[PDB]
Point group: D2
Chain length 293, copies 4
């Protein structure tokens, strides 16, 4: 079966104002590229080419202007709007017609991942034709997230959204893989006490039926925090340190399309031309003649 992707790049309220007064958090850069390149690249690494970008009404033209229809990168991009930030599970209602009868994956527009064999980690989750897959990651501050509790055998037995007394330090990350049941589960959700349609309620519905795979994303992966001005700075410095050490980019969509064979050398060469005078286009030109393992 085909798997379609959704990037939810909705409003971060007023929490980062005045920095985000003028423009959505996900159109701002982490080091050298727009924040949205990172979760987009995550979906591309999972082999997903048909992708819905959900943003605020005000910033959808900007996401559209930035990414186009995706055909330059061998993708098929569509756009939709989330009028009010009334919960992550709204993605599946907004995206119901887009998803149709296919499998799906949701990624949050402000989620950054780095590490070895992430392609294989996503490949495994994407291969499951039934059930849902999520990733749990050990964090200092689990109370900010959906929290997973495990029994002594290591089986996931409960999920709580932003608990006052977290049962573990394992947070659910902002990457979710779903089968054909998710739209119908989302359509039956009721708003929580904080007035949102909760993705954790979606995940708990799968858990109750024994159909939730909780994979550990180990400590050798970085799931970088973009929630505060402080953590934003850290993410930028993290990406800068890797890129300047390696001479290789993290989450370059043009590169990922080229390595997936979704575009050819001639198309990559055309994409390198507009930015030929700066580091990004120079990088793209170098991809045409260097073997990188």
């Amino acid at each position: 079966m085909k798997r379609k992707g959704i990037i939810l790049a909705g409003g971060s309220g007023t929490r980062l104002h005045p920095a985000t007064l003028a423009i959505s958090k996900q159109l701002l850069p982490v080091y050298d590229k727009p924040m949205i390149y990172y979760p987009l690249s995550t979906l591309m690494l999972a082999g997903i080419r048909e992708i819905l970008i959900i943003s605020t009404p005000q910033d959808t033209p900007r996401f559209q202007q930035l990414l186009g229809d995706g055909s330059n990168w061998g993708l098929d991009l569509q756009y939709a709007v989330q009028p009010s930030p009334d919960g992550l599970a709204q993605a599946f209602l907004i995206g119901e017609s887009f998803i149709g009868n296919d499998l799906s994956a949701l990624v949050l527009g402000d989620n950054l991942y780095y590490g070895h064999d992430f392609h294989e980690l996503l490949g495994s989750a994407s291969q499951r034709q039934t059930g849902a897959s999520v990733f749990a990651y050990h964090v200092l501050d689990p109370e900010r997230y959906g929290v997973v509790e495990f029994d002594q055998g290591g089986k996931a037995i409960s999920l709580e959204e932003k608990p006052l007394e977290p049962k573990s330090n394992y947070a659910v990350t902002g990457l979710y893989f779903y089968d054909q049941q998710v739209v119908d589960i989302a359509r039956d959700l009721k708003p929580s006490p904080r007035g949102e349609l909760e993705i954790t309620d979606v995940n708990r519905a799968y858990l109750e039926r024994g159909q939730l795979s909780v994979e550990i994303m180990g400590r050798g992966y970085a799931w970088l925090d973009t929630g505060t001005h402080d953590s934003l700075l850290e993410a930028g410095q993290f990406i800068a340190t890797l890129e300047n050490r390696q001479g290789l980019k993290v989450a370059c969509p043009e590169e990922i399309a080229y390595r997936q064979k979704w575009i050819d050398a001639a198309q990559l060469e055309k994409l390198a031309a507009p930015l030929a005078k700066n580091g990004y286009g120079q990088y793209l030109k170098r991809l045409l003649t260097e073997t990188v393992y």
Copy 2:
């Protein structure tokens, strides 16, 4: 016949950065990118406010003017009056005086680059000296590692500025001209007579050289105890953010908070500052504005 019985107006040039920082700047102008906790343009705006300037023209691209207007409005909230103009093509810094000719009128002026960040002690007093000069031009020179990127000032043995060179391959000194410029009423006429350089730009260094040739350029040293932060590259932008974060988290005080500067200048009163804090009350920025109302800061 004219009658006498002067005001200084400000201009912020915030016209993006072409393709130099793409793809980071594909969706939005460089000068709306945050430096740590606030939009880049807050920093040079705060610099003009610290110079006592209340009437300011923001020059930006046609595409992003509405975003600057959304952010800053007409300035009345901060005791300012802000006007807006567009720069359809990036034809050089000195074009600010042609675009802003009607805005300037017969007044003195100051131009600041929308990506210039300054920090340090007695900066208010450093600006005061330049602002109080009613004739000629005033610029600031700062020692940098890479003067070849800038307008460079050469000094004689007595410390007098004797030449200015734009991006010399072999700089005569390490003293770069910073992106803050004070001018008298001669500047619009000087700017009108400029020809484009080989790189296709109306050059601010040519304006400054015109004042130098008339013996009316003051070059003040901005000493090494001030920070003039680099926003030219993705690397330097990260450094700028880290620098501001380090200071603010150490001190519990903000750098370039326009609400604060307006309040300290008595351009807005306590009642007004309280109203500005209300929308941001659930975040650290609003809580800071609230703390300002009761705390004495020296």
Copy 3:
């Protein structure tokens, strides 16, 4: 066969003076722990418990004072001196009696690694009873390192030390696994034109006999640069960002010993006592009651 480890933590000349005037680079911290904890942890992750620490004559008492005989961490540590910085291959002459008839691994005392399944990456190299194994890593500045050239099939065909015209961007990292032949190869080395016994000559001797395994260390791993004041800062910020995000430490030797079962819960509890009032001892105490996957 048993595999023994060597950490070469010798002099970095005058290149980082005056910062390193008073004390060796490898006794200074990267964020929250002495630099030497990082390569030590790397050897421990490879399952190596018997380890020789080689330092300058002046700083050996300090390494000795810091780490002891290793019995507190379930290790067997020994110490030796490198009087002059006359090449990395001197490790095998200095360490000849220590190595005896066993397999060996050498790590540089200023080499920091991070990433997922690094234990498995080292396990594979450590399992080889014959030949040598090294890791190649794509870098911006290969001219600083031993550089590997590959043919079109991806086979390593040459190695050059600090070439003026590097044949690729793949640098050999500072972790080397050797069979029982390395001492004898090292004993036959002649000094290079720069007056050093070159580890690259050791590696080329294995390459010539078709006995060098060059594994790619992929871009999902971080091999952090400690060669300059600038890169030192970056390494610290990199480790800080991971540790403060996760609430888990990178290269905590006490933790690695505890997870290898080289020390028990009662021994870890004793190790947590001296530093109980600071973050490091608090971390160690938390390890006794938390399951980390």
Copy 4:
């Protein structure tokens, strides 16, 4: 009978940090850790040199005194005279005056913490005012986020300092006393009469309060345009390193280069500075010392 016909001596307290930063500090004292490109102790040493102080006592643990001596020697290379003393047990900051009693003799003094870093414009002049006071004590107050970690100064409505509290749970202000202290000849006698606090330390705040009670404490504000960098935690040490790196790489000038300060004070001449550059000539620090010989820096 004594005869009259004053000199100020300096003390740097560099006695480690107990176990607080272990295991990072197991092998070496905190004050020998680099901040970016130079040992931590260069920063407060440079601060005393900027105050015009040439005769300085370094107090350290018995274990690390040889390392400080290896680094700094007798000071003659930099136009200083350095002496050394040991602090066998960490019994409080004010113990510096008992350990250093013979060193101080009948002179004025200044005490700086070996982990205190300062940066900013006219810092030389800020120190000058304090140094020139021949009687009483002078300290500096700085606005911080976390005054509960420090000696805290309370001010009346006229801006006069009226109380000092060590680590108050409910601070009266956000003004912390920095780790730089200027004293007259009364300090050794004040220090001799101190009793240990509940935490088992001879407290500098008690010394300062004694001067306050005699009406002889000057509290000068170190304004928000100066950086007083935090070295208390692993996090803050990284921030300090990043802050210095950002300034030095922007300016092509160093912060707290003792060779430079000695040269600018005319305590060493060009010939001597050339000799100091020779050992470090293949690295950036030696190349910097060389550049100093030909370049005019304002």
